[PDB]
Symmetry: T
């Protein structure tokens, strides 16, 4: 149902923000500064997304996860500890991959909310998916690829 | 009931609601006086903007919104009570929460109705307003130490 | 009649006035639509804050202000008319000017009353409000091509 | 079978470009008592619908499409008609052309809402919903400027 | 007594008042710690600027304001108490309300005095300051669950 | 002399005053050039707003303010002197202070007149303006190392 | 006539111009009251800054600008008319446009003179001012439904 | 050729230029995507406002600017190419630099022409715009690792 | 040494921010709004502290933890999943407890950095400990207790 | 044995209060050519040292102390001398009193830096370091106003 | 001598000038310490931006600007003196005015040179810079009680 | 070497450093032109503030800072090179990183020296500046794809 999905996306968004901090810290290359501030922007944006999703889950009477243990236990986003220097394009491909994951899962949540008659969470997930899609186009354009490639 | 009648209905409901927000804004007393005072001012601004957007939307679809206190009291489904006997803060907050639940249910009915008639614009508008109303119900019900669905 | 009853009277008058300002804000049509639209928003904000300050001042002197639309309609001396048949821009501005003159005279009477009983605070407040209302009467009567005292 | 989303989005890119140029036409050639108010108003509308065009084009890019990027493609694919300014016109005439283009974009945007709702693209659906809301409000405002009902 | 002696007297009263506002600002404990903490900062700003305007106004009429703590303690009618044993929030708020009432009555006496000697400027100034003091008395007495005149 | 004639008189006085402020603004020379340059600009803005508000108030009471340099020179009681030989900073500041004293006394006469005829609005306005003028007299007389009376 | 005499001449012209802008600013009546009111204020600020910059430039080249209303009336070529009978909005706008044309032609003469004597600074300044004046002539002549030449 | 034909010609050139700026703004791919994306937005703002000022300046001198895409394509000397096959970042930047050089030379011709016919205003305007174009040519040619004149 | 301490405090600060979100979401009581915005302020502040600590660890050539697994494995701050409604005073006592923990550990880091001659990290930890001390006074004053009680 | 941190912090609370009142004294009774500049400057100094006093008192609360909160405690414990204004003084005189108080607070603040460094309270150490930095800069500025070296 | 060599010359002159502005900014003593302190900061910022724009303009025309202190000292025509024995405020201001006159004359020569070769961009830029420098010469020479051309 | 000599040494080092930052700011070419251009501007502002604070601190302790390019080149330990042959972006970034490492080591020596003499103020100042320098070394060494300690 909607509550399990919203909590699932809470965990996914927390792990996502931690990953955004990983790229924010370990990046090296010519595009260091631009993608550094860009990573800060992403941290703020997806943090606000996580806050709105969790408070929405509270609004519908649910209970969001509030510990790292619950996050790691329920998140479907994969995290990898940093062990050796990586290129900028690799970090951007991991970011784009997570963005595609959240795109698909958010779409499934849009269909689920549309069936269950929760138009609020439906519209919310629609807006979040819009921002995620725009970011997919931008970051896939950084890698010199089509948005559907 | 079609979309226009509902929009005017919510115009009256929102006006009476804002007047009530001023009632609590004025007659409140208690430990949480300042916080809920400025907070009531915030509610007045927010739902006043909601009322303006609803009325201008009703004008956009060629309707005619109610524009007098007589029409508001004649068509509103929100109950108002003149302040006579002193009331506690929790009482005023329970009246506020009650009206918020009323507007939540009615706004849901408006979302289904607009979804039926195919007016996606008013649908999305009522969706956003219902989002804000839900968040406020959670906040004020949490202030009273209660669950959002209680 | 004393100061408290007068302050409540002006609370009702100011509420009905703000509702009317929304009426013109919504139903106006003509070449000067945008200018008087934004201007009506400004008037709504200003006279709304006037109502808030008057009501909170009535609370400061230990009174109890009206807090429901029924009390407003029962105690207000400002007349409201539901919008039915289309009116011109100059007509709506003439109603606005009329209400402004009403609040001017009543506010003057309140200045005399507060000045007699020695309530200098409400005296100065009503003096400022009467200043703003006088300026608005000059401006809007100049819009209609008339003298401020005509 | 059914026309898809991308062709419609590009169509609205061209329509929005021609629209902005027309807004420049009224922005420059207007004369009358309401010169300043409708001048700054024309600037505001230009900013607003320019942002609409940019968002539509970037959304068309997001779904893997390619938006038109030349005046030739715009004039060849746009359904909004433009007229070069030759004889002096009144304020009401320019406002009637503006209102006409606004009604055109309103109807076409409605068709886009139905199409996006049909194909299941909820993002473009909501976006077109917002744009149609703004266009509806502007139709009410400018038709009220002409002393007319929003649906008249 | 004349205008200068009263204005300097209120300079001392306002200094002792601001110091007390810091006393509550520092030693307060309770559930309403943050709200009344920031509120105490606002009070410091307001009554401090009131003190500056009163002193510079006394300078404008050719007077000489007190400029040392000794003169303040020698001429102030506001009582200060060093903090020794812990007090509740309601106690500190009752002392604050007491000082606010003191300044209300004294400021009224200053309005009558300035009206008597014909200095209308200081009259209007004291009117505005007394207006703020009245509003604060209503708000803080509403925090204690009491009527503004009780 | 009634209120309208006085308000127009002060319109002319304020115009000539601002022109004089430009005279000092340009022909000043000395160590304190920058400070008194920006200060003269501040005075120009402030007294310009005073002149606009006074004239618009004169319109609010149904009067007709002077609107040409000829009428200003015809009714103004403030003296202007064309700049021919270089003057010191203290001289220009003494001319400024002198005009400030003139407007102080005349504005006080306006307070007595408006209070006598019962125009409380212009009374409060002129009270505020006289407050600002008094503060500026104290400031500039303190610049010259003199008591405000001064 | 050299550059200094021209700059002083335009100082007087700009002073009389701003005073006229206040004349229209106050005595205007009609449907477009608010728009042309704020617009007249904008013109007052803009041409006030032009007058300050022109006079300070005249000081920069070692000249001495006029600093009294008497000198302004003595050297200005812009005509002023005291307001006696009520005038329409189009009349005031035609006077404004007329003065704008006068300053346009004279400012062009100043461009030719400054370019001839080799003063490139005043050349560029007067070029910018003439640009603004030209744009305003187009705007206000478009308000009257006329071609800029128109 | 005269000033009006050149100004309209550059109106068309600037429109096609802004459309091309959107072409690169949308179809760009590479490591420098974000920096040159925001940079393309800045270019749109700058050259758009240049276009507005050029057109309104053409209006100020009594001309009639082009106001349709057909007139733009009929009179523009800037070449546009529909995007079909993918291009590199350096290619798009070389097309941008080419258009920038085109506008540089044409703008220089406009400076000579305006200086010839004696319109110093449009001369200075084209001087400023050409200054910006030169700075952008240096910056973007430095992006390609090339000399500004290469 | 300094690097191990800085990473340790990175984990502690991450778990801390997650806890601040827990109180931010599950709080109920009369002081709901004030402490809600206050919790937002704390999230921003300690997030900036964590960013500055991690980037400082990068400046001295260290490698900060960048996954929830590393955080949970190395953090010394205890987290508790929310299972039933709790009072405001309880949440404030947990917050104050974590603040005392970070106070003591930050003091130890000040002594360690002072011995090792790293005056930069020394001054940084001094400022952070100053803010933490002020917050301890404020929140302990909310509970009606002395700062040393 | 050794005097501790709390007594010093309270001492500086009283000193800072008396200092701010004195800054009000110069703020009001000043006359001279530099009236406006040193007037707004006196306001800036009042804000600055008021923030210093508030931070010192809240820091004293943070270490479990109790700051003085009455004028009686301030005058009884402050080491800064205040003088009621009786005869007119020049600008240089008021600036010499201000500079004197600034030097007093500089020296005492140095003693507080040594004491806090001794007892191991690094927080109050750094705070007093910042305050002493500001006081040093102001001593240089105001002694330069008097045409004197910062150490003269 | 051509345009590029002149632009580099003014780069060196502007760097040495900014360093001198810091010299007065640091070693000044006197009654006007604060005013000329902040003013020196303003001059440092302004003439620093002048240096940046001049150097980047030299880059735009394909030149190579000086980028080291050695090149600056070898090519600058502005004299610098290390501060050894104490100087008065008027002396430092006299050195500042002297350097301002130097940059005025050299900038004029650059206007003539750029005007001859047809570089209208650098011509207009140097015209603006000469305008600002002229204004500063008038202001600072007025500070010393002297005419701008004396 | 004591504290004053070190502070002056760092004044010279910081001035030569800022000049170098302008050198890279002007002569840079490559794909990362814009980002490192605005970034170089940021570095100029930051280290310029560092130089101002260091010099004013040296004045605070009674010292005399160097104030001429001759003194800077005579006492600075930072090497500058006039730009003759074209260099890559990575080369300029390696020179920048080298100078940053130089200032890091020297600032460390200053922290130890100030810690020895007991001047905690300059100690803390140099600590903050060294923090910023360390962060910048990490950032720019990460731009070059290198470890901060490489
Ligand atoms: Zn950002
Ligand atoms: Zn983003
Ligand atoms: Zn958050
Ligand atoms: Zn939140
Ligand atoms: Zn929240
Ligand atoms: Zn999943
Ligand atoms: Zn549904
Ligand atoms: Zn839907
Ligand atoms: Zn949405
Ligand atoms: Zn790549
Ligand atoms: Zn109904
Ligand atoms: Zn309670
Ligand atoms: Zn209120
Ligand atoms: Zn709020
Ligand atoms: Zn709310
Ligand atoms: Zn409204
Ligand atoms: Zn509205
Ligand atoms: Zn509206
Ligand atoms: Zn109902
Ligand atoms: Zn539908
Ligand atoms: Zn929506
Ligand atoms: Zn309760
Ligand atoms: Zn009309
Ligand atoms: Zn009309
Ligand atoms: Zn408005
Ligand atoms: Zn208004
Ligand atoms: Zn209200
Ligand atoms: Zn209120
Ligand atoms: Zn009644
Ligand atoms: Zn009545
Ligand atoms: Zn009419
Ligand atoms: Zn009466
Ligand atoms: Zn009309
Ligand atoms: Zn325009
Ligand atoms: Zn606008
Ligand atoms: Zn709009
Ligand atoms: Zn765009
Ligand atoms: Zn864009
Ligand atoms: Zn974009
Ligand atoms: Zn179509
Ligand atoms: Zn669907
Ligand atoms: Zn939506
Ligand atoms: Zn939407
Ligand atoms: Zn019409
Ligand atoms: Zn409680
Ligand atoms: Zn507040
Ligand atoms: Zn308050
Ligand atoms: Zn003060
Ligand atoms: Zn003051
Ligand atoms: Zn007494
Ligand atoms: Zn008393
Ligand atoms: Zn209680
Ligand atoms: Zn009275
Ligand atoms: Zn009287
Ligand atoms: Zn100022
Ligand atoms: Zn002033
Ligand atoms: Zn005005
Ligand atoms: Zn006005
Ligand atoms: Zn007005
Ligand atoms: Zn007279
Ligand atoms: Zn003197
Ligand atoms: Zn008043
Ligand atoms: Zn405007
Ligand atoms: Zn204008
Ligand atoms: Zn001026
Ligand atoms: Zn000026
Ligand atoms: Zn000036
Ligand atoms: Zn003449
Ligand atoms: Zn007309
Ligand atoms: Zn120019
Ligand atoms: Zn790359
Ligand atoms: Zn940018
Ligand atoms: Zn740009
Ligand atoms: Zn435009
Ligand atoms: Zn425009
Ligand atoms: Zn052509
Ligand atoms: Zn051509
Ligand atoms: Zn390349
Ligand atoms: Zn020329
Ligand atoms: Zn010519
Ligand atoms: Zn906050
Ligand atoms: Zn905080
Ligand atoms: Zn962060
Ligand atoms: Zn960061
Ligand atoms: Zn960072
Ligand atoms: Zn640990
Ligand atoms: Zn050490
Ligand atoms: Zn240390
Ligand atoms: Zn620190
Ligand atoms: Zn408790
Ligand atoms: Zn002097
Ligand atoms: Zn003051
Ligand atoms: Zn200041
Ligand atoms: Zn200061
Ligand atoms: Zn304080
Ligand atoms: Zn505080
Ligand atoms: Zn505090
Ligand atoms: Zn002591
Ligand atoms: Zn230690
Ligand atoms: Zn520190
Ligand atoms: Zn510190
Ligand atoms: Zn002296
Ligand atoms: Zn002096
Ligand atoms: Zn002097
Ligand atoms: Zn300044
Ligand atoms: Zn300057
Ligand atoms: Zn620079
Ligand atoms: Zn630069
Ligand atoms: Zn040379
Ligand atoms: Zn030379
Ligand atoms: Zn001198
Ligand atoms: Zn020559
Ligand atoms: Zn050395
Ligand atoms: Zn690359
Ligand atoms: Zn640059
Ligand atoms: Zn930046
Ligand atoms: Zn930086
Ligand atoms: Zn500096
Ligand atoms: Zn400085
Ligand atoms: Zn400084
Ligand atoms: Zn060295
Ligand atoms: Zn030591
Ligand atoms: Zn520090
Ligand atoms: Zn590289």
């Amino acid at each position: 149902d909607t509550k399990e999905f919203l909590n699932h996306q809470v965990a996914n968004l927390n792990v996502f923000t931690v990953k955004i901090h990983q790229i924010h810290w370990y990046m090296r290359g010519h595009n260091f500064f631009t993608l550094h501030e860009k990573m800060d922007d992403l941290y703020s944006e997806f943090g606000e997304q996580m806050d709105e999703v969790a408070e929405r889950l509270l609004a519908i009477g649910g209970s969001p996860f509030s510990t790292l243990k619950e996050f790691l236990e329920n998140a479907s986003v994969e995290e990898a500890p940093y062990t050796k220097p990586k290129t900028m394009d690799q970090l951007m491909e991991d970011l784009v991959g997570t963005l595609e994951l959240l795109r698909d899962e958010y779409k499934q949540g849009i269909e689920l909310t549309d069936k269950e008659g929760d138009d609020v969470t439906n519209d919310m997930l629609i807006a979040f998916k819009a921002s995620i899609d725009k970011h997919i186009w931008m970051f896939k354009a950084f890698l010199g690829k089509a948005p559907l490639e």
